[PDB]
Write a protein that binds this ligand. Structure first.
Ligand SMILES: O=c1[nH]ccn1Cc1ccccc1
Ligand SMILES: O=c1[nH]ccn1Cc1ccccc1
Ligand SMILES: O=c1[nH]ccn1Cc1ccccc1
Ligand SMILES: O=c1[nH]ccn1Cc1ccccc1
Ligand SMILES: O=c1[nH]ccn1Cc1ccccc1
Ligand SMILES: O=c1[nH]ccn1Cc1ccccc1
Lengths: 219, 219, 219, 219, 219, 219
């Protein structure tokens, strides 16, 4: 990653064994559970494109997902090259060349080039641009691997309302519902999918009920 | 988080794998036991709003709780915007814009904006303001998930008084009794809920008994 | 805690996940075994009152003990306020206010106030004063939870003398015998409580015997 | 490894116990799974030739692989000496000698010589040159230890298409297919090797199908 | 402990959770095996008397040993006070007082006094003096807890000579034989205590045999 | 160990709990497997003679080996004293004395003397000289504890050639064959010791076969 030292210069530091192991272990334990993505984002704080490729490449399983992710990165790289075409022919001696999509993705750029871009005044944030592409790809993977439609999350007859709501919102998160839909589902599908006893209690609360109020009501 | 370096400047540092893992593991092991909240506060020392969202978003279960927490944050954001309305229209070039509730909560502000506020002379402490909102939300969750009324904590006939007192005060903590009530319960409900043999001994001590004296008495 | 940096200034640093976890785990594993107290003291090296409250508040069990500890802290705070009454009415602008007992205990003081006191020339050591109160409280808890009187530690007929002496001094430590009594018990209760075969051997050594000499004698 | 300090000088630092243990443990757990190679590359960030030999030499098993790796290094060293012959006879007093292949590989050079080369202005990057040779050798080992031809990865009749695609691309990675072949296999061998029900669905999609679209289709 | 910072000043740093836990765990796992003493010495590198008392006091078991250790420390403190008597009556204002035996042992001195002594030009090395006393005490404990005389370590009839030699020298180490005796036992008791078949082979080697040669001979 | 600080001075730092524990654990898990020696070398990076004795002394088992190691160190110390005799009689006031073999081995020198030598301009590298002696001793131990002659490593009739080659080269490493012999064994003993089916295939390859080619051939 790129970090600041005591002279006030942002400098390269090696990715730590602790970071490398944390990422491989969260993928081993959680696969493409939605909460893996904020973990990836946080473990890749300050990452160069080299560091992002290290993290993705240290994953041993899930090679279907990793091939889909490469396809997404290639789509984003291709859109970058459409928006930001680069001069053909020789670099000005000693000067910074403009990054292409494959430079951002770390496959045609050196670590030295990456550092040069990320530490330019002002930064050309190739690490942050590439991380955006990767997270776009990972979100597609999370949606693909979501096992269950929200339509099939219904409260069991002896299922505590809290356990049902946990399943419901775990499902909406993987299915990648907007916050607007998560906020609004409280006075639609969450009530419809409740068991008869709880649905009667929720129906009676009226509209405008907070989730806290609905959970209190069906305790 | 924001930390101080050797030039005397408060600077951004990445959230550590150790911090990320500590928080996910305490939620896995303890759920919304009351002691999770001081742990959250301490693990989020120096946190930006980005870091607070990372910690909450890395939680995989408990999505009912996480949706209630978003509802609380939205209520606090809305009260902030009532107290501190911001100018519409263009930012003064190169100058700091005033934060809105959604900027404090990290959903409409950049990490660079957050750093700018938190390191301003004097600080606009968006991390501390947002942490207050989050802890307000988490305290509601702790109360909601408290399984047992204090009225139902009664000393078993062969239950050591110490084990009963541990249950009693564990319950009052989750039910979120004020310190005044915790202090005063020693000469009310704690005696009433004691078994006959201990209640007789405590009744005789008189008023003014310390908890230490009551625990000694029923040893 | 408060630590020194490279300019020679004592500065605040966040409590570490390693410290937080060490303390919660020693309380989980050892409860109020006497050796928990030196561990608390060492894990709280440099602690602000905020940090001491974090450590105590991260404990999930033992709420009888934690309520007794609050009662002790309140007694010490009340004695502080007797010795060191503070001016009522407005703070001199920009100047340091004098701490009250509740400021020392971290319930009515800010982290900024605490730092101000602890880093004043010369320090007003609110962290060390509060730690003294807490350790006074924890020592009461250790004594309360000591399960066995020293009168009931007697050497079994096939019990190795060393195993008996370990039980004896483990008991005296929890019962909170002075060093004078621990030193002097070697030529009283330790011999009286020994089995017949060892008591005969120890009786014959004469007075003045070192513990090493008594342990050699009954090997 | 070579790291930068506060004066702006790249300096030697000891290889950490954490790095040493991480590498030995990944070889113990994963052997020559392809993902071991990016892990080796990342754990050896900044490595001197001495550090690379330490990492390889701390491996206890797999001595067939380690002997093949030495053979590869010797081939690369021999090609280096062809491209970059060095002066015979005495070093200019106090001056830097040119590295030979065995100096790059750390067997005939001192740590001091290695540091001298790696910190020269401009660097003679003996650590990076040697790491290239080692990774060339390790890639041969990965290919040798790949247990299964891609021709024998075929979707079972009740095998979820995703599990088949994971096996397929895990196999292509170990067999060390180019990215061009991995990209193009989606509209050849991946369909041919699918079960009848999925092959019918994929045959119908037409050409141009993304992996995401094929995986959606056979969900 | 006392460590050096960047201004070139030896400064106090808190004992680390890692150090505290390492020591408690080695005593839990190894008790008073001789190898515990070099571990104590190394874990207490740079220790103040306060830090040495922390380490000893964090031990929960072995209170017979810990009482013997206090007796040894008191003997050494008493000899210090014989060699180095201190002036009675008032300290020169702002000046360093001379340490007494109980100051060296940390029971009558403050951490500030200890730092003052250890960082004086030239140091009054109270940490190193106290560590010497403690190690003297711990060596007595190791000897006391040694279970077996060297006279009773004899090679079994089907016992590999190497396993016998390991037992022999493990025993001599706990019994606290000088290096002179360990060196010389190779051509006395080690041969006498060998089984008949090995004793015949060793008898024939002649005098002057290295341990390596004796171990080769009886392989 | 000796490390560099920010003023550009090589300074003493305490051996870390992580280093101490890593070494004791590798000896517990691997004994005198050959790969323990590069691990010792790497864990002792920068070590003073004091640190090397700490590491060897923290080993609890293997006291036959540790006594042989002392014998080797004494032989090397004696050869040092032959090559580098030191002046008898008084040190020049305030000046550096020349090290004797026992000073290099840390038994008659202080840590301060060791630091003085290792940080002299130019260094008298007592840590590196002593580490050489120790590794010479440890290599003898590895050879002594090697359980099996290379003559007895023969490919089983259903043993995969790769598993046989792993045994063969694991054995040559412990028996401490030169690299020349390891390189040349590929076209001698490795073929002779192969099973009939593989020997026929290898016999036919001709001379000049790489290990990779032989392993491919007998796959
Ligand atoms: O190296 C890796 N692992 C996952 C993605 N990448 C970068 C990449 C992107 C696109 C095609 C090929 C390689
Ligand atoms: O990102 C997260 N996780 C939990 C809360 N937040 C911030 C937030 C607040 C309110 C609505 C939407 C998002
Ligand atoms: O916060 C905590 N946990 C244990 C003690 N304290 C401080 C305190 C002291 C007294 C009353 C109320 C609170
Ligand atoms: O020391 C090691 N372990 C694996 C490779 N190397 C360096 C080397 C290269 C070639 C021949 C001999 C030694
Ligand atoms: O505090 C501890 N634990 C073990 C020794 N010490 C210091 C000490 C020495 C002698 C008498 C009393 C106390
Ligand atoms: O202290 C230790 N442990 C193993 C070797 N050494 C140093 C030494 C060398 C020779 C004789 C005596 C002691």
């Amino acid at each position: 990653p790129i970090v600041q030292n005591l002279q006030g210069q942002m400098v390269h530091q090696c990715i730590s064994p602790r970071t490398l192991n944390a990422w491989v272990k969260v993928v081993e334990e959680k696969a493409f559970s939605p909460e893996v993505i904020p973990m990836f984002s946080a473990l890749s704080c300050g990452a160069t494109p080299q560091d992002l490729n290290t993290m993705l490449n240290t994953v041993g399983g899930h090679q279907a997902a990793m091939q889909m992710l490469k396809e997404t990165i290639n789509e984003e790289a291709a859109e970058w090259d459409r928006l930001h075409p680069v001069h053909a022919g020789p670099i000005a001696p000693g000067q910074m060349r403009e990054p292409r999509g494959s430079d951002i993705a770390g496959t045609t750029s050196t670590l030295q080039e990456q550092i040069g871009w990320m530490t330019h005044n002002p930064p050309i944030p190739v690490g942050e641009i590439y991380k955006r592409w990767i997270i776009l790809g990972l979100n597609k993977i999370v949606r693909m691997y979501s096992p269950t439609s929200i339509l099939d999350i219904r409260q069991g007859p002896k299922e505590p309302f809290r356990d049902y709501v946990d399943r419901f919102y775990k499902t909406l998160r993987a299915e990648q519902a907007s916050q607007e839909v998560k906020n609004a589902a409280t006075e639609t599908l969450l009530v419809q999918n409740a068991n008869p006893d709880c649905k009667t209690i929720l129906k009676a609360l009226g509209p405008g009920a907070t989730l806290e109020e609905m959970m209190t009501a069906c305790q």
